[PDB]
Amino acid sequence: VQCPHFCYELDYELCPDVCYV
Amino acid sequence: KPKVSLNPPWNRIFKGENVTLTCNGNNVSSTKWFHNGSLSEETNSSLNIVNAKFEDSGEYKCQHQQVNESEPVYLEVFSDWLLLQASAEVVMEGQPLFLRCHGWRNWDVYKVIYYKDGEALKYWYENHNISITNATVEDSGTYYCTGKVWQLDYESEPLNITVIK
Ligand SMILES: *[C@@H]1O[C@H](CO)[C@@H](O[C@@H]2O[C@H](CO)[C@@H](O[C@@H]3O[C@H](CO)[C@@H](O[C@@H]4O[C@H](CO)[C@@H](O)[C@H](O)[C@@H]4O)[C@H](O[C@@H]4O[C@H](CO)[C@@H](O)[C@H](O)[C@@H]4O)[C@@H]3O)[C@H](O)[C@H]2NC(C)=O)[C@H](O)[C@H]1NC(C)=O
Ligand SMILES: *[C@@H]1O[C@H](CO)[C@@H](O[C@@H]2O[C@H](CO)[C@@H](O[C@@H]3O[C@H](CO)[C@@H](O)[C@H](O)[C@H]3NC(C)=O)[C@H](O)[C@H]2NC(C)=O)[C@H](O)[C@H]1NC(C)=O
Ligand SMILES: *[C@@H]1O[C@H](CO)[C@@H](O[C@@H]2O[C@H](CO)[C@@H](O[C@@H]3O[C@H](CO)[C@@H](O)[C@H](O)[C@@H]3O)[C@H](O)[C@H]2NC(C)=O)[C@H](O)[C@H]1NC(C)=O
Ligand SMILES: *[C@H]1O[C@H](CO)[C@@H](O)[C@H](O)[C@H]1NC(C)=O
Numbered sequence: 001v002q003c004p005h006f007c008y009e010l011d012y013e014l015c016p017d018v019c020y021v
Numbered sequence: 022k023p024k025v026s027l028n029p030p031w032n033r034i035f036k037g038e039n040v041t042l043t044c045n046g047n048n049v050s051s052t053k054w055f056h057n058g059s060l061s062e063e064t065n066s067s068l069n070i071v072n073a074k075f076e077d078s079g080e081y082k083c084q085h086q087q088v089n090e091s092e093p094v095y096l097e098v099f100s101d102w103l104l105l106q107a108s109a110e111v112v113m114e115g116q117p118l119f120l121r122c123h124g125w126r127n128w129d130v131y132k133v134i135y136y137k138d139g140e141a142l143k144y145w146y147e148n149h150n151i152s153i154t155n156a157t158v159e160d161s162g163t164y165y166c167t168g169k170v171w172q173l174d175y176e177s178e179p180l181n182i183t184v185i186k
Contacts, residue, residue, distance in 0.1 A: 001102075004171045016125050017036075017100045 023091040025083050030108050033180070034073055035125060036100040042068045044083035044091065053084035073098050102175035103130060105166050112160075112184045118153035122166035122177065130168035138162040156184045 007015035024045040034040055044052045044066045054061035054068050057079040061068065070077050078098045084090045108119035124130040130148040134141050143151055148168065153160055165179040 001175075002173055004173065014126065016102055018102070 022089055023083055023085050023087055025081060025091050025094040027094070027096075030119075031106040031121070031123075032095060032110065033097050033099060033104055033106055035104060035123070036073060036075065036098055037126075038073050040070045040073065040096065042070070042081055042083070042094065042096075044068075044085060050086045055082040055084070055090070056080070070096075075100075099178070101125070101178065102170055103166060103168055103177040105164060105177045105180045107164075107180060107182055110180065110182055112156045112182070114156055114158055114184055114186045116156055118156045118160065118182070118184070120151045120153075120164060120166075120182075122148060122150075122168055124148065124168065124170055128170050130170055133166060133168040135164065135166045137164050158184050158186065160184045 001018050003015050003019035007013060007019045013020060026043045026045065028041045028043060046066045051064055052066045054063040075098050078096055080093045080095055082090050082093055102125050104123045106121040106123050108117070112118045120135060122130060122133050122135060131146060133145045133148050135143050135151045161182060161184045163179045163181050165177050167174065167176045
Protein backbone atom coordinates (compact mmCIF):
# COMPACT_ATOMS: atom_id res chain seq x y z
CA VAL A 1 0.00 0.00 0.00
CA GLN A 2 1.62 3.21 -1.23
CA CYS A 3 0.85 6.45 0.65
CA PRO A 4 1.53 10.15 -0.17
CA HIS A 5 4.64 11.84 1.27
CA PHE A 6 2.75 14.10 3.68
CA CYS A 7 1.60 11.10 5.68
CA TYR A 8 5.18 10.96 6.93
CA GLU A 9 6.47 14.50 6.32
CA LEU A 10 3.95 16.29 8.59
CA ASP A 11 3.92 16.45 12.37
CA TYR A 12 0.60 14.69 13.05
CA GLU A 13 -0.23 11.52 11.07
CA LEU A 14 -3.29 12.21 8.93
CA CYS A 15 -3.36 8.96 6.94
CA PRO A 16 -5.02 5.59 7.57
CA ASP A 17 -3.17 3.03 9.73
CA VAL A 18 -2.39 0.91 6.71
CA CYS A 19 0.27 3.55 5.92
CA TYR A 20 2.19 3.20 9.18
CA VAL A 21 4.63 0.70 10.73
CA LYS B 22 -40.72 -5.37 19.59
CA PRO B 23 -38.44 -2.31 19.11
CA LYS B 24 -35.75 -1.73 16.48
CA VAL B 25 -32.46 0.17 16.36
CA SER B 26 -31.71 2.43 13.38
CA LEU B 27 -28.56 4.27 12.34
CA ASN B 28 -28.06 7.82 11.15
CA PRO B 29 -26.25 7.93 8.84
CA PRO B 30 -27.40 4.32 7.95
CA TRP B 31 -23.83 3.07 7.56
CA ASN B 32 -22.93 0.11 9.87
CA ARG B 33 -19.37 0.41 8.62
CA ILE B 34 -17.59 3.72 9.32
CA PHE B 35 -14.16 5.30 9.70
CA LYS B 36 -12.19 5.86 12.86
CA GLY B 37 -13.18 9.31 13.95
CA GLU B 38 -16.58 9.56 12.37
CA ASN B 39 -19.92 9.97 14.10
CA VAL B 40 -23.02 7.82 14.18
CA THR B 41 -26.27 7.86 16.12
CA LEU B 42 -28.25 4.73 16.97
CA THR B 43 -31.94 5.33 17.51
CA CYS B 44 -34.29 3.03 19.41
CA ASN B 45 -37.55 2.74 17.42
CA GLY B 46 -39.48 5.67 18.88
CA ASN B 47 -43.23 5.04 18.62
CA ASN B 48 -46.41 4.28 20.65
CA VAL B 49 -41.82 8.12 27.26
CA SER B 50 -40.23 6.09 30.07
CA SER B 51 -36.64 4.89 29.58
CA THR B 52 -34.33 3.25 27.05
CA LYS B 53 -31.69 0.63 27.84
CA TRP B 54 -28.58 0.34 25.65
CA PHE B 55 -26.44 -2.81 25.44
CA HIS B 56 -22.97 -2.58 23.86
CA ASN B 57 -21.37 -6.01 23.49
CA GLY B 58 -23.76 -7.41 26.10
CA SER B 59 -22.82 -4.78 28.71
CA LEU B 60 -25.37 -2.15 29.77
CA SER B 61 -24.37 1.35 28.63
CA GLU B 62 -24.82 4.44 30.76
CA GLU B 63 -27.15 5.88 28.12
CA THR B 64 -30.87 6.36 28.83
CA ASN B 65 -32.17 8.35 25.82
CA SER B 66 -33.77 6.71 22.77
CA SER B 67 -30.71 7.86 20.82
CA LEU B 68 -27.15 6.80 21.62
CA ASN B 69 -24.56 9.18 20.15
CA ILE B 70 -21.18 7.85 19.04
CA VAL B 71 -18.58 10.58 18.50
CA ASN B 72 -15.00 10.34 17.21
CA ALA B 73 -15.58 6.61 16.76
CA LYS B 74 -12.80 4.39 18.05
CA PHE B 75 -12.24 0.75 17.15
CA GLU B 76 -13.54 0.01 20.64
CA ASP B 77 -16.95 1.36 19.53
CA SER B 78 -17.33 -1.53 17.12
CA GLY B 79 -19.66 -4.33 18.15
CA GLU B 80 -23.21 -5.41 18.81
CA TYR B 81 -25.81 -2.86 19.95
CA LYS B 82 -29.30 -3.40 21.39
CA CYS B 83 -31.96 -1.20 22.97
CA GLN B 84 -34.74 -2.06 25.41
CA HIS B 85 -37.98 -0.15 26.06
CA GLN B 86 -41.04 -1.08 28.19
CA GLN B 87 -41.98 -3.75 25.66
CA VAL B 88 -40.27 -6.54 27.66
CA ASN B 89 -38.36 -8.08 24.73
CA GLU B 90 -35.11 -6.48 23.53
CA SER B 91 -34.43 -5.20 20.02
CA GLU B 92 -32.68 -7.19 17.30
CA PRO B 93 -28.87 -6.81 17.31
CA VAL B 94 -27.24 -4.16 15.14
CA TYR B 95 -23.55 -4.58 14.36
CA LEU B 96 -21.28 -1.57 13.93
CA GLU B 97 -17.75 -1.83 12.57
CA VAL B 98 -15.00 0.81 12.68
CA PHE B 99 -12.33 0.83 9.97
CA SER B 100 -9.20 2.81 9.22
CA ASP B 101 -8.25 2.54 5.52
CA TRP B 102 -8.33 4.78 2.37
CA LEU B 103 -11.70 3.72 0.94
CA LEU B 104 -14.48 1.95 2.75
CA LEU B 105 -17.43 0.39 0.98
CA GLN B 106 -20.56 1.37 2.84
CA ALA B 107 -23.91 -0.38 2.50
CA SER B 108 -27.37 0.77 3.55
CA ALA B 109 -27.78 -2.83 4.73
CA GLU B 110 -25.87 -6.10 4.37
CA VAL B 111 -28.97 -8.30 4.38
CA VAL B 112 -31.64 -6.91 2.09
CA MET B 113 -35.12 -8.26 1.48
CA GLU B 114 -35.95 -8.79 -2.20
CA GLY B 115 -37.88 -5.76 -3.36
CA GLN B 116 -36.36 -3.06 -1.18
CA PRO B 117 -33.56 -0.60 -2.10
CA LEU B 118 -29.84 -1.21 -1.58
CA PHE B 119 -27.40 1.71 -1.37
CA LEU B 120 -23.64 1.43 -1.70
CA ARG B 121 -21.15 4.20 -1.17
CA CYS B 122 -17.39 4.10 -1.89
CA HIS B 123 -16.45 6.27 1.08
CA GLY B 124 -13.07 8.00 1.27
CA TRP B 125 -10.85 8.62 4.27
CA ARG B 126 -11.42 11.93 6.08
CA ASN B 127 -14.03 12.61 3.36
CA TRP B 128 -11.14 13.36 1.05
CA ASP B 129 -11.96 13.32 -2.69
CA VAL B 130 -12.22 10.03 -4.60
CA TYR B 131 -11.95 9.99 -8.41
CA LYS B 132 -12.14 7.18 -10.99
CA VAL B 133 -14.50 5.26 -8.71
CA ILE B 134 -15.28 1.73 -9.84
CA TYR B 135 -17.68 -0.61 -8.02
CA TYR B 136 -17.09 -4.34 -8.40
CA LYS B 137 -19.30 -7.37 -7.66
CA ASP B 138 -17.79 -10.86 -7.53
CA GLY B 139 -14.73 -9.54 -9.34
CA GLU B 140 -16.67 -7.77 -12.08
CA ALA B 141 -16.62 -4.01 -12.61
CA LEU B 142 -20.25 -2.85 -12.39
CA LYS B 143 -19.99 0.93 -12.79
CA TYR B 144 -17.47 3.68 -13.30
CA TRP B 145 -17.74 7.32 -12.31
CA TYR B 146 -15.25 10.09 -12.65
CA GLU B 147 -16.54 12.10 -9.70
CA ASN B 148 -17.30 9.93 -6.70
CA HIS B 149 -20.86 8.72 -6.85
CA ASN B 150 -23.03 6.30 -4.90
CA ILE B 151 -24.41 3.18 -6.54
CA SER B 152 -28.10 2.60 -5.97
CA ILE B 153 -30.04 -0.64 -6.48
CA THR B 154 -33.69 0.49 -6.58
CA ASN B 155 -35.27 -3.00 -6.61
CA ALA B 156 -33.06 -5.56 -4.87
CA THR B 157 -32.90 -8.95 -6.56
CA VAL B 158 -31.50 -12.25 -5.30
CA GLU B 159 -29.10 -11.94 -8.24
CA ASP B 160 -27.79 -8.77 -6.59
CA SER B 161 -26.18 -10.91 -3.90
CA GLY B 162 -22.42 -11.29 -3.91
CA THR B 163 -19.24 -9.70 -2.61
CA TYR B 164 -18.85 -6.04 -3.53
CA TYR B 165 -15.89 -3.67 -3.31
CA CYS B 166 -14.66 -0.47 -4.97
CA THR B 167 -11.46 1.19 -6.08
CA GLY B 168 -10.69 4.87 -6.52
CA LYS B 169 -7.99 7.51 -6.41
CA VAL B 170 -7.19 9.63 -3.39
CA TRP B 171 -4.34 12.14 -3.53
CA GLN B 172 -3.52 10.83 -7.05
CA LEU B 173 -2.85 7.28 -5.81
CA ASP B 174 -4.87 4.11 -6.38
CA TYR B 175 -6.59 2.36 -3.50
CA GLU B 176 -8.90 -0.61 -3.11
CA SER B 177 -11.51 -1.19 -0.44
CA GLU B 178 -12.01 -4.26 1.69
CA PRO B 179 -14.69 -6.52 0.21
CA LEU B 180 -18.17 -6.73 1.69
CA ASN B 181 -20.62 -9.62 1.45
CA ILE B 182 -24.14 -8.53 0.58
CA THR B 183 -27.04 -10.96 0.53
CA VAL B 184 -30.50 -10.43 -0.93
CA ILE B 185 -33.06 -12.96 0.37
CA LYS B 186 -36.78 -13.27 -0.36
C1 LIG C 1 -17.13 -4.71 21.24
O1 LIG C 1 -17.00 -5.88 20.42
C2 LIG C 1 -16.25 -5.64 19.22
C3 LIG C 1 -16.29 -6.91 18.41
O2 LIG C 1 -17.63 -7.25 18.06
C4 LIG C 1 -14.84 -5.21 19.57
O3 LIG C 1 -14.12 -4.93 18.37
C5 LIG C 1 -12.77 -5.23 18.31
O4 LIG C 1 -12.11 -4.23 19.08
C6 LIG C 1 -10.69 -4.23 18.89
C7 LIG C 1 -10.12 -3.14 19.78
O5 LIG C 1 -10.70 -3.17 21.08
C8 LIG C 1 -10.43 -3.97 17.43
O6 LIG C 1 -9.10 -3.51 17.15
C9 LIG C 1 -7.96 -4.29 17.16
O7 LIG C 1 -7.18 -3.74 18.23
C10 LIG C 1 -5.77 -3.97 18.18
C11 LIG C 1 -5.18 -3.38 19.46
O8 LIG C 1 -4.64 -2.08 19.24
C12 LIG C 1 -5.19 -3.34 16.92
O9 LIG C 1 -3.74 -3.42 16.92
C13 LIG C 1 -3.16 -4.39 17.75
O10 LIG C 1 -2.63 -3.74 18.92
C14 LIG C 1 -2.11 -4.68 19.87
C15 LIG C 1 -1.70 -3.91 21.11
O11 LIG C 1 -1.71 -2.51 20.87
C16 LIG C 1 -0.96 -5.47 19.26
O12 LIG C 1 -0.49 -6.44 20.18
C17 LIG C 1 -1.42 -6.16 17.97
O13 LIG C 1 -0.33 -6.82 17.34
C18 LIG C 1 -2.04 -5.14 17.02
O14 LIG C 1 -1.04 -4.21 16.59
C19 LIG C 1 -5.75 -4.13 15.74
O15 LIG C 1 -5.23 -3.61 14.50
C20 LIG C 1 -4.23 -4.43 13.96
O16 LIG C 1 -3.54 -3.85 12.87
C21 LIG C 1 -2.40 -4.63 12.46
C22 LIG C 1 -1.66 -3.84 11.40
O17 LIG C 1 -1.41 -2.51 11.84
C23 LIG C 1 -2.85 -6.03 12.00
O18 LIG C 1 -1.71 -6.82 11.70
C24 LIG C 1 -3.67 -6.70 13.11
O19 LIG C 1 -4.20 -7.93 12.64
C25 LIG C 1 -4.80 -5.79 13.54
O20 LIG C 1 -5.71 -5.63 12.46
C26 LIG C 1 -7.28 -4.12 15.75
O21 LIG C 1 -7.73 -2.92 15.12
C27 LIG C 1 -10.87 -5.14 16.63
O22 LIG C 1 -10.63 -4.90 15.24
C28 LIG C 1 -12.36 -5.17 16.84
N1 LIG C 1 -12.92 -6.28 16.10
C29 LIG C 1 -13.75 -6.04 15.10
C30 LIG C 1 -14.31 -7.24 14.35
O23 LIG C 1 -14.11 -4.90 14.80
C31 LIG C 1 -14.92 -3.96 20.40
O24 LIG C 1 -13.61 -3.54 20.75
C32 LIG C 1 -15.74 -4.23 21.64
N2 LIG C 1 -15.84 -3.01 22.41
C33 LIG C 1 -16.20 -3.04 23.69
C34 LIG C 1 -16.28 -1.71 24.43
O25 LIG C 1 -16.48 -4.08 24.27
C1 LIG D 1 -18.36 14.56 14.96
O1 LIG D 1 -19.04 15.35 15.92
C2 LIG D 1 -18.19 16.33 16.56
C3 LIG D 1 -19.12 17.21 17.38
O2 LIG D 1 -19.14 16.82 18.75
C4 LIG D 1 -17.40 17.18 15.54
O3 LIG D 1 -16.24 17.71 16.19
C5 LIG D 1 -16.28 18.99 16.71
O4 LIG D 1 -16.57 19.90 15.66
C6 LIG D 1 -16.68 21.27 16.11
C7 LIG D 1 -16.85 22.08 14.84
O5 LIG D 1 -16.33 21.38 13.72
C8 LIG D 1 -15.45 21.73 16.97
O6 LIG D 1 -15.79 22.87 17.78
C9 LIG D 1 -15.92 24.19 17.33
O7 LIG D 1 -16.16 24.25 15.93
C10 LIG D 1 -16.57 25.59 15.57
C11 LIG D 1 -17.06 25.56 14.14
O8 LIG D 1 -16.44 24.50 13.41
C12 LIG D 1 -15.41 26.55 15.82
O9 LIG D 1 -15.76 27.86 15.39
C13 LIG D 1 -15.04 26.52 17.31
O10 LIG D 1 -13.90 27.32 17.55
C14 LIG D 1 -14.74 25.08 17.74
N1 LIG D 1 -14.60 25.03 19.19
C15 LIG D 1 -13.40 25.00 19.76
C16 LIG D 1 -13.35 24.94 21.28
O11 LIG D 1 -12.35 25.04 19.13
C17 LIG D 1 -15.04 20.65 17.96
O12 LIG D 1 -13.82 21.01 18.60
C18 LIG D 1 -14.91 19.32 17.26
N2 LIG D 1 -14.40 18.26 18.13
C19 LIG D 1 -15.02 17.95 19.26
C20 LIG D 1 -14.42 16.81 20.08
O13 LIG D 1 -16.03 18.54 19.67
C21 LIG D 1 -16.89 16.38 14.35
O14 LIG D 1 -16.49 17.28 13.34
C22 LIG D 1 -17.94 15.45 13.83
N3 LIG D 1 -17.42 14.66 12.73
C23 LIG D 1 -18.10 14.57 11.60
C24 LIG D 1 -17.47 13.71 10.50
O15 LIG D 1 -19.19 15.13 11.41
C1 LIG E 1 -18.12 -13.81 2.11
O1 LIG E 1 -18.57 -14.77 1.15
C2 LIG E 1 -17.48 -15.56 0.65
C3 LIG E 1 -18.01 -16.35 -0.54
O2 LIG E 1 -18.97 -17.33 -0.15
C4 LIG E 1 -16.92 -16.44 1.78
O3 LIG E 1 -15.77 -17.17 1.29
C5 LIG E 1 -15.67 -18.49 1.70
O4 LIG E 1 -15.16 -18.52 3.03
C6 LIG E 1 -15.14 -19.85 3.58
C7 LIG E 1 -14.63 -19.74 5.00
O5 LIG E 1 -15.31 -18.72 5.72
C8 LIG E 1 -14.26 -20.76 2.72
O6 LIG E 1 -14.36 -22.11 3.20
C9 LIG E 1 -13.25 -22.63 3.85
O7 LIG E 1 -12.25 -22.89 2.86
C10 LIG E 1 -11.03 -23.41 3.44
C11 LIG E 1 -10.02 -23.56 2.31
O8 LIG E 1 -10.51 -24.42 1.30
C12 LIG E 1 -11.30 -24.74 4.15
O9 LIG E 1 -10.11 -25.20 4.76
C13 LIG E 1 -12.39 -24.56 5.20
O10 LIG E 1 -12.73 -25.82 5.76
C14 LIG E 1 -13.63 -23.92 4.58
O11 LIG E 1 -14.24 -24.83 3.66
C15 LIG E 1 -14.68 -20.71 1.25
O12 LIG E 1 -13.77 -21.44 0.46
C16 LIG E 1 -14.73 -19.26 0.78
N1 LIG E 1 -15.19 -19.18 -0.59
C17 LIG E 1 -14.78 -18.19 -1.38
C18 LIG E 1 -15.30 -18.17 -2.81
O13 LIG E 1 -14.01 -17.30 -1.00
C19 LIG E 1 -16.49 -15.57 2.97
O14 LIG E 1 -16.27 -16.41 4.10
C20 LIG E 1 -17.52 -14.49 3.35
N2 LIG E 1 -16.85 -13.50 4.19
C21 LIG E 1 -17.18 -13.39 5.48
C22 LIG E 1 -16.42 -12.37 6.30
O15 LIG E 1 -18.09 -14.04 6.00
C1 LIG F 1 -39.32 -5.57 -7.92
O1 LIG F 1 -40.24 -4.83 -7.12
C2 LIG F 1 -40.81 -3.74 -7.87
C3 LIG F 1 -41.42 -2.77 -6.89
O2 LIG F 1 -40.58 -1.63 -6.74
C4 LIG F 1 -41.74 -4.30 -8.92
O3 LIG F 1 -42.42 -3.25 -9.59
C5 LIG F 1 -40.88 -5.09 -9.91
O4 LIG F 1 -41.72 -5.74 -10.86
C6 LIG F 1 -40.02 -6.14 -9.18
N1 LIG F 1 -39.03 -6.67 -10.10
C7 LIG F 1 -39.01 -7.97 -10.39
C8 LIG F 1 -37.93 -8.44 -11.37
O5 LIG F 1 -39.80 -8.79 -9.92
